[PDB]
């Protein structure tokens, strides 16, 4: 049986901090077959299950999409496991792939911090592997304007204090550019 990539061939891919995760088990799949539908620009690489994350992502930020980077993408948006084989692929949607639709712009989280109820301690919220930023609950799916400041007062059950985030934007390109994060679990 063949793994179905159809979920990602239709609709608007989310922004990096809302990466869409597809999990594949018990099916055959050829990654090159999936990539033959795109115009691949870059890839970096370092069975039981295949995890495929995808999102809108501008090629001009390719240096930020790296395990090495102390930049905001790896700190606050998206981080892959360091213990499994992984790949990162940047590709462009070709004109004859008409069913992937464009968002208004590219967005990413530039800062995400808790401010504790002592009114003194700021705690940067570094994203963990295979997890979303805690700030996805306050950052909209598309950031309204570069530099937007989002904030929420937390409840006692949530730990008190505040959650704050800052959003950044990059102008949309003529063809949508995308990122793919792949992690394999070998048995």
């Amino acid at each position, epitope marked *: 049986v063949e793994c179905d990539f159809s979920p990602l061939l239709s609709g608007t891919p989310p922004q990096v901090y809302n990466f869409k995760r597809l999990v594949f088990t018990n099916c055959n799949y050829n990654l090159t077959k999936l990539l033959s539908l795109f115009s691949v620009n870059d890839f970096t690489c370092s069975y039981s299950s295949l995890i495929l994350d995808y999102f809108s992502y501008p090629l001009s930020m390719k240096s930020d999409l790296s395990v090495s980077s102390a930049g905001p993408i790896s700190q606050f948006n998206y981080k892959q496991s360091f213990s499994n084989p992984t790949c990162l692929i940047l590709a462009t949607v070709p004109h004859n792939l008409t069913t992937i639709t464009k968002p208004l712009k590219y967005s990413y989280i530039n800062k995400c*911090s808790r*401010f504790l109820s002592d009114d003194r301690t*700021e705690v940067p919220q570094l994203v963990n592997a295979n997890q979303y930023s805690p700030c996805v609950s306050i950052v909209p799916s598309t950031v*309204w304007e570069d*530099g*937007d400041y*989002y*904030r929420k007062q937390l409840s006692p059950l949530e730990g008190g204090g*505040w959650l704050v985030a*800052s959003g950044s934007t990059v102008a949309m390109t003529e063809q949508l550019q995308m990122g793919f994060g792949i992690t394999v679990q070998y048995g």
Partner: antibody
Amino acid sequence: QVQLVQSGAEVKKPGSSVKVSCKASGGTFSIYAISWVRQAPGQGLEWMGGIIPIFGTANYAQKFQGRVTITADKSTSTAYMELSSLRSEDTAVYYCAREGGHQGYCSGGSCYDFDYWGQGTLVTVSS
Amino acid sequence: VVMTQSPLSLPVTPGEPASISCRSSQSLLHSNGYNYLDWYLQKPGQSPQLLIYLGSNRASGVPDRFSGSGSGTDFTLKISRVEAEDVGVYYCMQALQTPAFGGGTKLEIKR
């Protein structure tokens, strides 16, 4: 609600620098945007710059870029405005002002619905 | 962004309505659906105070007599029945990116 108490009046020689303070009470100080606005005698209001303390990110009007430094100290809930190379045209009442705090988010990084105002600080630049 | 406020001064007979206009050199309507225009009043010898924010939102404790309207470049502050307490200088303020005040309108009592 919120109270903004500014430091007292000052007299400064031309060419020197002045630093005015604004101590805030009520609410989480580091979370809300604070601005500085001045008013020369008989003239209108003029926005100088602002800061959100938790970010430490201050912005300024182009007219005051390079002469004004706005800072904030969460240990005392105080914002500061320092203006250097004082000229007689800088004689003015300086006000601190804080957002009302109920906008759902701050577009572009900062909120400017100035619901709270300090009492003003008169700065007289003269020989 | 240039804000043109008119008139410069406004004598108003007590009890009668008043209107102040503010025209911006570029649209103040943000993609989030709000117009970034505030109205402030500064009474004699006092600090400024907020009347209207984000085009038409009345600030807390501001009487129903004040209302703001408009979208894009033309905005109006209206006072339904002017009162002695209302004397002072009214300022509009655009907040689309970097705040800037209009020149002010001095409201005084007509006699």
